[PDB]
From Swiss-Prot, chain B:
Protein name per Swiss-Prot or TrEMBL: DNA-directed RNA polymerase II subunit RPB3
Name of the gene this protein is made from: RPB3
Function per UniProt: DNA-dependent RNA polymerase catalyzes the transcription of DNA into RNA using the four ribonucleoside triphosphates as substrates. Component of RNA polymerase II which synthesizes mRNA precursors and many functional non-coding RNAs. Pol II is the central component of the basal RNA polymerase II transcription machinery. It is composed of mobile elements that move relative to each other. RPB3 is part of the core element with the central large cleft and the clamp element that moves to open and close the cleft. Seems to be involved in transcription termination.
Single Gene Ontology BP annotation: transcription elongation by RNA polymerase II
Miscellaneous notes: Present with 10000 molecules/cell in log phase SD medium.
A single GO molecular function term of this UniProt record: metal ion binding
Keywords for the protein's UniProt record, in alphabetical order: Acetylation, DNA-directed RNA polymerase, Metal-binding, Nucleus, Transcription, Zinc
Swiss-Prot record, chain D:
Species the sequence originates in: Saccharomyces cerevisiae (strain ATCC 204508 / S288c) (Baker's yeast)
Database matches in InterPro entries: RNA_pol_su_RPB10, RNA_pol_suN_Zn-BS, RPABC5/Rpb10
Domain of life: Eukaryota
Subcellular locations according to the entry: Nucleus, Nucleolus
Keywords of the record: DNA-directed RNA polymerase, Isopeptide bond, Metal-binding, Nucleus, Ribosome biogenesis, Transcription, Ubl conjugation, Zinc
UniProt name for this protein: DNA-directed RNA polymerases I, II, and III subunit RPABC5
Gene that encodes the chain: RPB10
Pfam short name (any one): RNA_pol_N
Oligomer status and interactors: Component of the RNA polymerase I (Pol I), RNA polymerase II (Pol II) and RNA polymerase III (Pol III) complexes. Component of the RNA polymerase I (Pol I) complex consisting of 14 subunits: RPA135, RPA190, RPC40, RPA14, RPB5, RPO26, RPA43, RPB8, RPA12, RPB10, RPC19, RPC10, RPA49 and RPA34. The complex is composed of a horseshoe-shaped core containing ten subunits (RPA135, RPA190, RPB5, RPO26, RPB8, RPB10, RPC10, RPA12, RPC19 and RPC40) where RPA135 and RPA190 form the DNA-binding cleft.
Gene Ontology biological-process entries: nucleolar large rRNA transcription by RNA polymerase I; ribosome biogenesis; RNA-templated transcription; termination of RNA polymerase I transcription; termination of RNA polymerase III transcription; transcription by RNA polymerase I; transcription by RNA polymerase II; transcription by RNA polymerase III
Curated annotation (Swiss-Prot), chain E:
This protein's domain notes: The C-terminal domain (CTD) serves as a platform for assembly of factors that regulate transcription initiation, elongation, termination and mRNA processing.
Function summary: DNA-dependent RNA polymerase catalyzes the transcription of DNA into RNA using the four ribonucleoside triphosphates as substrates. Largest and catalytic component of RNA polymerase II which synthesizes mRNA precursors and many functional non-coding RNAs. Forms the polymerase active center together with the second largest subunit. Pol II is the central component of the basal RNA polymerase II transcription machinery. During a transcription cycle, Pol II, general transcription factors and the Mediator complex assemble as the preinitiation complex (PIC) at the promoter.
Superkingdom as given in the UniProt entry: Eukaryota
Positions of crosslink type Glycyl lysine isopeptide (Lys-Gly) (interchain with G-Cter in ubiquitin): 64
Organism whose genome encodes this protein: Saccharomyces cerevisiae (strain ATCC 204508 / S288c) (Baker's yeast)
Subunit structure: Component of the RNA polymerase II (Pol II) complex consisting of 12 subunits. Interacts with DEF1; the interaction is direct and serves to bridge RPB1 to the Elongin complex in a DNA-damaged dependent manner. Interacts with the Elongin subunit ELA1. Interacts with the Elongin subunit ELC1. Interacts with ASK10. Interacts with ESS1. Interacts with RTT103. Interacts with SHE2.
Lineage of the organism: Eukaryota, Fungi, Dikarya, Ascomycota, Saccharomycotina
Curated annotation (Swiss-Prot), chain I:
Source organism superkingdom: Eukaryota
InterPro entries linked: NA-bd_OB-fold, RPABC3
Record's keyword terms, sorted: Acetylation, DNA-binding, DNA-directed RNA polymerase, Nucleus, Phosphoprotein, Ribosome biogenesis, Transcription
Keyword Transcription attached: yes
Functional description taken from the UniProt entry: DNA-dependent RNA polymerases catalyze the transcription. of DNA into RNA using the four ribonucleoside triphosphates as substrates. Common component of RNA polymerases I, II and III which synthesize ribosomal RNA precursors, mRNA precursors and many functional non-coding RNAs, and small RNAs, such as 5S rRNA and tRNAs, respectively.
Stated name of the protein: DNA-directed RNA polymerases I, II, and III subunit RPABC3
GO BP term, example: transcription by RNA polymerase III
């Protein structure tokens, strides 16, 4: 059904499952020769580069949050706060 | 003389009870261990079984042959296999012993270490000789056999030390003690009523002056005096098992200075 | 294992250099942890040591038979008649330094059985290999090169952990996994795919 | 099953002392504990070694080829 | 028994009291008797405590009882869990048992109840009354080799091509 | 080997237990853990 | 003063296994029940004609030793003839931590 | 069930496990044999190419190497054969099945699996010999011994797969278990036992060693701490250095029994800025306890930092106890001769306290207690006597055993064994029983045939007088059997039946998880809980705190929370508040001040309406007690000079605080209303601890301190919330079934057979009872 | 770079509660009948029996790794026979105008009582203790 | 099976030196010397002697894990005095002491009967 970027209702923060999966997912790509959006301070381990992209919040992904009834909310790694 | 001195007490061909005085504990032990594990010796390390009918299986005897102590006084002039340029061993790094037995006697024939035979050139030096201390003169019973049971071997002895295996070590045991009257309180005796009575006294109390109640606790007291007693197997005369000890240990402490140099 | 349900396995081997010794010279062959006593409450095992450490010196095959007229007190006397502390303990020096061990250790013989089931008869690894025929899943047993189990319970934990992908992975890419075709009409495997 | 050359724990040679000890039993008719001390085995470690070993070999020997 | 209570002064004090313990169970009547507090009366047979007092109260009992089964061993479990369970066993309507005769009959798709005690029997009567399965169940996906909607999969991840530009 | 020779089996009302009558005839401590425990006894 | 009969010895209530266990009258009742199942997972000399037996799988302990501590019950269990372990110089203490 | 719901799998190994006090907590020793067998598919990338070609060059036999290269053309190059073995040029895109290497995360586990924790991820550490070597403390979670236990290891495969292990399954994360809102790994055996000894005031350490010990803690800042004692010989206290392992910032107040900031018995426990100030360190301080050291470090410093702690602590202790030696032997089981005879009669005095009642009933002179046979009433006392004896017989040996007895020591540290054990070995065994009723009459009217019929005396119904030291008697022996034998039985029943319960429970709640809206639903959509746990908090972030507002006389309450700016004796003495003197009287403040109080007041009644018991200690998110403790020494607050908080500053921020403690976020009423609810309980605690008077008279917070204490609470709370994703259903199940396996077993159906009853919703319960007040 | 306390006390009693090497001590002051003392002490390197004349001192001087000997010829505020170093944890108010402070030297506790160290006793860890005769 | 070869307890393997000296940064003027194919025997010893040199502010050593023959020794000294040099002496000192003992022992042995 979708939901406006306003009227948004989820948690402003990133869930462990999310972050967990983002890094993974991102690694996977990086490990696949996808483009890396951060300067590698010399890093060479994908999941480690991923940890970097994720701290300069330079990961081009979007976490779609399905709700019990099907509608979803879309947040960007950008927005989502990362406490953990 | 200059520093750490000794006062040998009893002393035979197999033991060397003695007293090490004015040294650091570390040093006493350091030595002890050295004696136990790193003194180069000789012993069987390869058995080429040609024929055997005994009830002891091949590798069994094998193991035994290794344990059987061998002469090793000139050891210090028989290169370790790994260094001698010969493809897999030579008179210049190894000793060869043969073994043959047959059940001629209609009543159990014994195979003793004396039945070993040296077939490699000795080059004139005390080595590779099955050491005997048995009254009769046949030491260490290798194995028995019946009717027509045979046993043709061939061994090769090499250097090696108690690190690579004990069958090499010459030590076999070593007494060690100090502060017979707990003066540094290096312990806390466990009792039910009174330590003194329940916890036996050591023959080594005498050689050191008793307590003297009143006296406060001596704290600046360290550890002079140790009552060792290097025993021995025979591969080496109890003395060398103590000299070569102080020797090998010393060489090591050098190869650190030597390495500090090439660096 | 001893003879008191004291089953336990090796953790490491040491040599006389590193081994804790008793002035006499002697050193142990075994070194079981003190903790394995208080709750097992097997004192018999504890006693056998004393009885044996005695009949080891006297050479009089100690008797530890069931209910009899023997005592612990009755033995501590015999061991004392020999010079070593009446309870078994002895002074010992820490092999690395050679310093004394503040406390004493209950030292002395004990019979120990070497039960079968050794390690190199179980160590087992597999990364793909023989595959069953009916199922097409890894075969069973270390004997046939088989694979290990990831059953219900181990799943239930991954679900717990919330480890979605890893679950799918154990379940597919590392076991079954198969590519079939369907009809968008009648949801069956009917389809006759000539991938060519 | 044959005497154990050398003592486990301690290390001292002990493979010869079989017959010597075994004799101090039938002939010189003595009691274990003492026999040992005479053979030189003083500490229980290298003591228990003899006092226990059961010479099965003799039984083994008694078969045939 | 030992029952703590509000002293007039404010403190909480040990104001013990006598109480009767039964050995049979007929609530609906022992309740209507003179002399007792028909407000604090409690039977461990929640089955009963639910037919009389009412489900909601029942839950409170079912829980209370279960809690006592874990505390009698000196172990502690955080509410939430026994709570959740007690709840699952009660929402539906009355007392739904954690057994083949209960929670395994609910509107949950086939494939899921499949993985428990009646398997084929359950499958058969699925193609019979042409059931439809959502594949929202954990089990479901596991059987298909699909990433289930669980933690790591309670959502989707996408490449916002837009933000994939300001990044360079 | 001996032990195995003196063994007892018992198919399928509180058997598993250790009975008084079991004194002197069957061993009290020798029996298999869990499963068929107390169903197999040693004389 | 009625005793019709009297037990040869009490230790005869035990069975094969238990009769090897030392001081059994000094253990938590169960600790014996286990030991009455491990002595069956041990190694020794199951016969002496083994150098002539072609049985699938078998273990012989190089240097068997008749136990120091014993039981009169062993004499009939022919133990001192075919033991199943070794008298080892034990040391109950904490060391490396292994 | 056996093919789809569970399968045999590849990339898996199993062997025997053994302890190795030299591995970090989160590691695991993989034997080279296996590291060389197991493989990981890495994808050739400029980042590695080099490293990878090396492994490929190395081959499948050396260790750090590989054994399979695969190019785009979907073809396997078997490194062990192929005439091109050493040749090969890699290609970006190709993959290289290589060997498992140091630090490849893997899933380790021990069946039976019934915990999130029965399976955790470890750092792989390739080691020789053949056994998985795992750290000790991570033992209890897997619930394993080294008595020949085997464990399974699974190896990840996708770069994202690993991700899931290291980010959610790694051991350091499992430290605080939600199944019981407390840590779940601790310190045991040697490390524990030893950690106590090393602590004692009595225990002093000299230079030569202190130095080595320092060296062992790998994160030592190279600052040989200043000796406690310097006088003749510079010495160090155990406590002194074990504290080198304890990281800065930590804090800890204990208070056992006789504790007094000078704890003579050296009880309690107090650690400041991470330096042990006083109190023996044992099970209660460094074990898997509630307010434990671990419990803190974790929630405070980090999950990674706490994992590193086990390491340090262990190494230090272990190395010390390594030399300080330790052991146990029979002598520890024998107490003072007089204490023996004193017991022999304490038993015998208990035999006549029985005999008397035996005859006193053999005459029909006993009042039949209500609801019990004259018989049932006879036994009930008998047993109660013998046991009353058996226990105090022990309490004698338990006290006559010296602070040097090893066995006792182990009991104190709590590393092993308990009271009963001492008793049964040294004093008196006990009265054997079967089904409650002491050994029965199998033999017509008597126990054994060694007894004259109708002999009810204890020496027949099954009472063992001797101790395990003395040795049972034939009769005693047999009875103890029959009795012990009962255990071995049900144990093997409470194991089979437990397994089922545990399973159902799971299948019954799989589908349940917390959904993004913060509701708890299953696979249909059916709400089960409208807020996980009636509060939305992840069990993991919770501790026992105290709701001071509840307990305490109506009197004390006033003297503590009441503030009246219109009274010389009920106002804040200006010695506390900067603007104190200029407040006394101000009427517009007295209203805030009075609002505050008419609230703390409402809170009271409210709480007393919920927790009737009067019990004040409850599990809740955000540990405020400690949150302040830090604020304290973090701003070196001096208890002398005055604060600088406007009374508004306070009361008007505490309010603004509650405002940001959001659980649910909805934009309407029905939702933004459940909000206030799910919080309510918390705030009470909140308003309780941040009450004006308190805030200024007990913990002299400045504005800085306060504004900080506030920030922390809000965020530390927003952390304790529950993550929409958690598969709470399974969790809950396990959390219950799990401890339902550890159940190893005043006269009612209780325990496992009971729990079975309950779940089955059985109509005919053995015991039906019912309490009426 | 100062000193922070001076006085002499008398041991009312010495207590060994299952501590072979250390006994806690309580003594009184030979001046103000206010200053009482409670201090744990190593009765092995510095024996002490009931009723004696001990001299107590404090001060924070004569925090970077501690250097071994060498000082065999350097500074030495050691004109005593017992010198510990620990920290002070609490500053209690024993009613009235009485202020007491507790101390701990990694295991050895201490309690002081009086009222004139209002500006003498700091509140920092630094706090060497001393004893003579 | 996985059991290493016994002789890896004393024989250095391909490309390794008895010593490896890494400069400790944790504190100024101090070092971490890694001794290969060695152990307590020589470690503890060079540690004690090394503790006498009044110029040695710090000195301890440790076997990182029983499985491997090797150990780390950390030494700290007074500025203007390189520790490497300190190590030297402390060994010479150890040798010399031994040089005497080898002598003084034999002295007493020659004077013996048996
Ligand atoms: Mg087990
Ligand atoms: Zn050669
Ligand atoms: Zn020996």
């Amino acid at each position: 059904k979708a939901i406006p970027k306003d009227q948004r209702a989820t948690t402003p923060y990133m869930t462990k499952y999310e972050r967990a999966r983002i890094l993974g997912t991102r690694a996977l790509q990086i490990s696949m020769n996808a483009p890396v959006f951060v300067d590698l301070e010399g890093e060479t381990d994908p999941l480690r580069i991923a940890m970097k992209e994720l701290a300069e919040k330079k990961i081009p992904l979007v976490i779609r949050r399905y709700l019990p009834d099907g509608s979803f909310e879309d947040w960007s790694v950008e927005e989502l706060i990362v406490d953990l | 003389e200059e520093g750490p001195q000794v006062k040998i007490r009893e002393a035979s061909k197999d033991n060397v009870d003695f007293i090490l005085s004015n040294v650091d504990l570390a040093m006493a032990n350091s030595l002890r261990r050295v004696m136990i594990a790193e003194i180069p010796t000789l012993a069987i390390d390869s058995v080429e079984v040609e024929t055997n009918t005994t009830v002891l299986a091949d590798e069994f005897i094998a193991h035994r042959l290794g344990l059987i102590p061998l002469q090793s006084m000139d050891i210090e002039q028989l290169e370790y296999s790994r260094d001698c340029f010969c493809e897999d061993h030579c008179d210049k790094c190894s000793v060869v012993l043969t073994l043959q037995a047959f059940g001629e006697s209609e009543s159990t024939t014994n195979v003793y270490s004396k039945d070993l035979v040296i077939v490699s050139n000795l080059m004139g030096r005390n080595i590779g000789h099955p050491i005997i201390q048995d009254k009769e003169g046949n030491g260490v019973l290798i194995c028995k056999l019946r009717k027509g049971q045979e046993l043709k071997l061939t061994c090769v002895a090499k250097k090696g030390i108690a690190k690579e295996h004990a069958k090499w070590g010459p030590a076999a045991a070593i007494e060690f003690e100090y502060d017979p009257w707990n003066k540094l309180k290096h312990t806390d005796y466990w009792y039910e009523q009174d330590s003194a009575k329940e916890w036996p006294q050591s023959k080594n109390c005498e050689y050191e002056d008793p307590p003297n109640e009143g006296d406060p606790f001596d704290y600046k007291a360290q550890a002079d005096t140790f009552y060792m007693n290097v025993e021995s197997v025979g591969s080496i005369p109890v003395d060398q098992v103590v000299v070569r000890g102080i020797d090998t240990l010393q060489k090591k402490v050098a190869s650190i200075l030597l390495a500090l140099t090439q660096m | 294992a001893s003879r008191h349900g004291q089953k336990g396995t090796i953790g490491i081997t040491y040599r006389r250099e590193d081994m804790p010794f008793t002035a006499e010279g002697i050193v142990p062959d075994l070194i079981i942890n003190p903790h394995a006593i208080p709750s097992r409450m097997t004192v018999a095992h504890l006693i056998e040591c004393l009885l044996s450490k005695v009949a080891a010196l006297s050479g009089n095959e100690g008797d530890a038979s069931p209910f009899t007229d023997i005592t612990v007190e009755g033995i501590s006397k015999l061991l004392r008649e020999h010079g070593y502390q009446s309870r078994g303990f002895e002074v010992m020096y820490n092999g690395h330094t050679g310093k004394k061990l503040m406390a004493q250790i209950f030292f002395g013989p004990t019979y120990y059985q070497r039960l079968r089931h050794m390690v190199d008869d179980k160590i087992h690894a597999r990364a793909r290999g023989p595959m069953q025929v009916l199922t097409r899943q890894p075969v069973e047993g270390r004997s046939r090169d088989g694979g290990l189990r990831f059953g219900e319970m181990e799943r239930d934990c991954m679900i717990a952990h919330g480890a979605a992908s890893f679950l799918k992975e154990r379940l597919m890419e590392a076991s079954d996994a198969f590519r079939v075709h369907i009809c968008g009409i009648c949801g069956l495997m009917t389809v006759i795919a000539k991938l060519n | 099953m044959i005497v154990p050359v050398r003592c486990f724990s301690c290390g001292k040679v002990v493979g010869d002392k079989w017959e010597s000890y075994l004799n101090l039993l039938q002939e010189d008719e003595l009691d274990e504990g003492t026999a040992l001390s005479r053979l030189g085995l003083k500490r229980y470690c290298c003591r228990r070694m003899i006092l226990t070993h059961v010479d099965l070999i003799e039984k083994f020997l008694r078969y045939n080829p | 028994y030992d029952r703590k209570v509000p002293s007039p002064t404010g403190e909480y004090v040990k104001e013990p009291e006598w109480v009767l313990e039964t050995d049979g169970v007929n609530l609906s009547e022992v309740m209507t008797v003179p002399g007792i507090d028909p407000t604090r009366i409690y039977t461990n047979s929640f089955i009963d405590i639910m037919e009389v007092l009412g489900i909601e109260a029942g839950r409170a009992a079912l829980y209370k009882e279960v809690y006592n089964v874990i505390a009698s061993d000196g172990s502690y479990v955080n509410y939430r869990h026994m709570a959740l369970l007690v709840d699952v066993m009660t929402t539906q309507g009355g007392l739904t048992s954690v057994t083949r005769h209960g929670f395994n009959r609910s509107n949950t798709g086939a494939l899921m109840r499949c993985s428990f005690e009646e398997t084929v029997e359950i499958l058969f009567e699925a193609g019979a009354s042409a059931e439809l399965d959502d594949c929202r169940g954990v089990s479901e996906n596991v059987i298909l080799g699909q990433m289930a909607p669980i933690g790591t999969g309670a959502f989707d991840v996408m490449i916002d091509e837009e933000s994939l530009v300001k990044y360079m | 080997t001996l032990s195995h020779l003196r063994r007892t089996n018992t198919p399928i009302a509180k058997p598993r237990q250790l009975h008084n009558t079991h004194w002197g005839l069957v061993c009290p401590a020798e029996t298999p853990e869990g499963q068929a425990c107390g169903l197999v006894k040693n004389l | 003063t009625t005793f019709t009969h009297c037990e040869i010895h009490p230790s005869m209530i035990l069975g094969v296994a238990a009769s090897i266990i030392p001081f059994p009258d000094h253990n938590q009742s169960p600790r014996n029940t286990y030991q009455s199942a491990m002595g069956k997972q041990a190694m020794g000399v199951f016969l002496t004609n083994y150098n002539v037996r072609m049985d699938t799988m078998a273990n012989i302990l190089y240097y068997p030793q008749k136990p120091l501590g014993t039981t009169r019950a062993m004499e009939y269990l022919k133990f001192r003839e075919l033991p199943a372990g070794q008298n080892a110089i034990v040391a109950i203490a904490c060391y490396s931590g292994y | 069930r056996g093919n789809l719901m569970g399968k045999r799998v590849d990339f898996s190994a199993r062997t025997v496990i053994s302890g190795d006090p030299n591995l970090e907590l989160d590691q695991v020793g993989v034997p080279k044999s296996i590291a060389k067998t197991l493989t990981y598919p890495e994808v050739v990338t400029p980042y590695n190419i080099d490293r990878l070609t090396q492994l490929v060059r190395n081959g499948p036999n050396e260790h750090p190497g590989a054994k399979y290269v695969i190019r785009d053309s979907g073809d396997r190059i078997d490194l062990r054969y192929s005439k091109r073995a050493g040749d090969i040029q890699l290609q970006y895109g190709w993959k290289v099945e290589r060997h498992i290497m140091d630090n490849d995360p893997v899933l380790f586990n021990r069946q039976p699996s019934l915990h999130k924790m029965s399976m955790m991820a470890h750092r792989v550490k390739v080691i020789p010999y053949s056994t998985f070597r795992l750290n000790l403390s991570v033992t209890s979670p897997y619930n394993a011994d080294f008595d020949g236990d085997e464990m399974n290891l699974h190896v990840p495969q996708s770069e994202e797969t690993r991700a899931e292990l290291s980010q959610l399954c790694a051991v350091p994360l499992q430290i605080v278990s939600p199944q019981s809102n407390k840590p779940c790994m601790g310190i045991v055996q040697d490390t524990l036992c030893g950690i106590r000894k090393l602590t004692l005031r009595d225990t002093f350490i000299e230079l030569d060693q202190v130095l080595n010990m320092l060296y062992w803690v790998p994160d030592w800042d190279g600052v040989i701490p200043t000796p406690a004692i310097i006088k003749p010989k510079p010495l160090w206290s155990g406590k002194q250095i074990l504290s080198v392992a304890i990281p800065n910032g930590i804090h800890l107040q204990r208070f056992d029994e006789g504790t007094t900031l000078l704890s003579p018995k050296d009880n309690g426990m107090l650690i400041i800025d991470g330096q042990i100030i006083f109190g023996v360190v044992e099970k209660k301080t460094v074990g898997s306890s509630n307010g434990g050291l671990i419990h803190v470090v974790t929630r405070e410093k980090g999950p990674q930092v706490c994992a590193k702690l086990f390491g340090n602590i262990q190494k230090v202790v272990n190395f010390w106890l390594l030399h300080n030696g330790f052991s146990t032997g029979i002598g520890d089981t024998i107490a003072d001769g007089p204490t023996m005879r004193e017991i022999t009669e304490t038993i015998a005095e208990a035999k006549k306290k029985v005999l008397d009642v035996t005859k006193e009933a053999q005459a029909n002179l006993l009042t039949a207690k209500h609801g019990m046979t004259l018989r049932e009433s006879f036994e009930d006392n008998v047993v109660r006597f013998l046991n009353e004896a058996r226990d105090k017989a022990g309490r004698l040996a338990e006290v006559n055993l010296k602070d040097l007895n090893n066995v006792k020591q182990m009991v104190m540290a709590g590393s092993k064994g308990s009271f009963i054990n001492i008793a049964q070995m040294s004093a008196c065994v006990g009265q054997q029983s079967v089904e409650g009723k002491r050994i029965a009459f199998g033999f017509v009217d008597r126990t054994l045939p060694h007894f004259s019929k109708d002999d009810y005396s204890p020496e027949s119904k099954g009472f063992v007088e001797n101790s395990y030291l003395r040795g049972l008697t034939p009769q005693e022996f047999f009875f103890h059997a029959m009795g012990g034998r009962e255990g071995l039985i049900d144990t093997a029943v409470k194991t089979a039946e437990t397994g089922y319960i545990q399973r159902r429970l799971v299948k019954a709640l799989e589908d349940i998880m917390v959904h993004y809206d913060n509701t708890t639903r299953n696979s249909l959509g059916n709400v089960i809980q409208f807020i996980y746990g009636e509060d939305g908090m992840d069990a993991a972030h919770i501790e026992k705190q105290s709701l001071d507002t509840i307990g305490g006389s109506d009197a004390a309450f006033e003297k503590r929370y009441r503030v009246d700016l219109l009274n010389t004796d009920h106002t804040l003495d200006p010695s506390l508040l900067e603007s104190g003197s200029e407040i006394l009287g101000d009427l517009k403040l007295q209203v805030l001040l009075d609002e505050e109080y008419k609230q703390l007041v409402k809170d009271r009644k409210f709480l007393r309406e919920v927790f009737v018991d009067g019990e004040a200690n409850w599990p809740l998110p955000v540990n405020i007690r400690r949150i302040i403790q830090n604020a304290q020494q973090t701003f070196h607050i001096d208890h002398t000079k005055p604060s600088d908080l406007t009374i508004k500053d306070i009361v008007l921020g505490v309010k603004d605080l509650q405002e940001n403690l959001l659980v649910l976020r909805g934009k309407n009423e029905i939702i933004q209303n459940a909000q206030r609810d799910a919080v309510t309980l918390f705030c009470c605690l909140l308003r309780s601890r941040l009450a004006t008077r308190r805030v200024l008279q007990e913990y002299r917070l400045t504005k800085q301190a306060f504004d900080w204490v506030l920030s922390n609470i809000e965020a530390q709370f927003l952390r304790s919330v529950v993550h929409p994703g958690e598969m709470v259903g399974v969790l809950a199940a396990q959390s219950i079934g799990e401890p339902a396996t550890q159940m190893t077993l005043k006269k009612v159906t209780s325990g496992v057979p009971r729990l079975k009853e309950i779940l089955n919703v059985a109509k005919n319960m053995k015991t039906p009872s019912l309490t009426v007040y | 770079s100062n000193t922070l306390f001076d006085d002499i006390f008398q041991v009312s009693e010495v207590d060994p509660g299952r501590y072979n090497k250390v006994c806690r001590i309580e003594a009184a002051s030979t001046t103000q009948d206010q200053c009482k003392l409670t201090l744990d002490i190593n009765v092995e390197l510095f024996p002490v029996a009931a009723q004696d004349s001990l001299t107590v001192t404090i001060a924070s001087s004569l925090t970077r790794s501690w250097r071994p000997p060498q000082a065999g010829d350097r500074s030495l505020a050691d004109d005593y026979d017992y010198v510990m170093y620990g920290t002070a944890y609490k500053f209690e108010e024993v009613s009235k105008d009485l202020i007491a402070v507790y101390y701990s030297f990694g295991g050895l506790l201490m309690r002081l009582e009086g009222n004139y160290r209002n500006l003498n006793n700091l509140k920092q860890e630094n706090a060497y203790l001393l004893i003579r005769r | 099976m996985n059991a290493p070869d016994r002789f890896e307890l004393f024989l250095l393997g391909e490309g390794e030196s008895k010593l490896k000296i890494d400069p400790d940064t944790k504190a100024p003027n101090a070092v971490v010397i890694t001794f290969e194919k060695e152990d307590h025997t020589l470690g503890n010893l060079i540690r004690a002697e090394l503790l006498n040199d009044r110029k040695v502010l710090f000195a301890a050593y440790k076997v990182e894990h029983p499985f491997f023959a090797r150990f780390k020794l950390r030494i700290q000294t007074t500025e203007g005095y390189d520790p490497k040099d300190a190590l030297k002496n402390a060994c010479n000192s150890i040798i010399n002491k031994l040089g005497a003992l080898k002598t003084n022992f034999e002295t007493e042995w020659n004077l013996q009967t048996l």
